[PDB]
Design a binder for this molecule. Structure first.
Ligand SMILES: *[C@@H]1O[C@H](CO)[C@@H](O[C@@H]2O[C@H](CO)[C@@H](O)[C@H](O)[C@H]2NC(C)=O)[C@H](O)[C@H]1NC(C)=O
Lengths: 50, 99
């Protein structure tokens, strides 16, 4: 068999899922400061009851 | 009133000083000591205030139980308190990057 047809190949672009990605979370940013003022306050205001 | 209290400690680069959970800046590298060029590290304190203890053994205050293994201790007495922390080498302890 010979053919008079001209081929053409089209495959659909497959699905692709995007997972959530973060370089730094806000908890790491809150921990970036050398002294979280709030936690220092809460610790130091327990001295009499401790 | 005598008070013994365990606290956390946080130092940022270059790690020539750190803080404590109460908020007190200790002006000395957490790795300053006597072994392997540790006297190169920074301490703005008179050298008599800092004492390093080889083969120290720690006794729990509540459990009243000596335990663990020899831990080379570091003690620095400020004009208002005295801190004790296990001396560890600087290179294997910290890192400038994060996986
Ligand atoms: C039509 O579609 C593609 C080319 O766009 C070919 O399918 C892939 O071919 C590769 C080798 O080139 C195989 O490893 C894959 O298994 C094939 N499928 C996919 C989804 O990649 C296919 O061969 C083309 N048709 C012809 C006749 O070549």
């Amino acid at each position: 068999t010979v053919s008079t047809f001209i081929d053409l190949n089209i495959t659909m672009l497959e699905d692709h899922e995007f997972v959530p990605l973060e370089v730094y979370t806000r908890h790491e940013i809150k921990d970036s400061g050398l002294l979280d003022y709030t936690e220092v306050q809460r610790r130091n205001q327990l001295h009499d009851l401790r | 009133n005598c008070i013994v209290e365990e606290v956390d400690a946080r130092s940022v680069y270059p790690y020539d000083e750190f803080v404590l959970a109460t908020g007190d800046f200790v002006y000395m590298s957490p790795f300053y000591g006597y072994r392997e060029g540790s006297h190169t590290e920074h301490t703005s304190y008179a050298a008599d205030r800092f004492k390093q203890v080889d083969g120290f053994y720690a006794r729990d205050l509540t459990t009243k139980a000596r335990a663990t293994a020899p831990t080379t201790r570091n003690l620095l007495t400020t004009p208002k308190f005295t801190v004790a922390w296990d001396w560890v080498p600087k290179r294997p302890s910290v890192c400038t990057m994060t996986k």
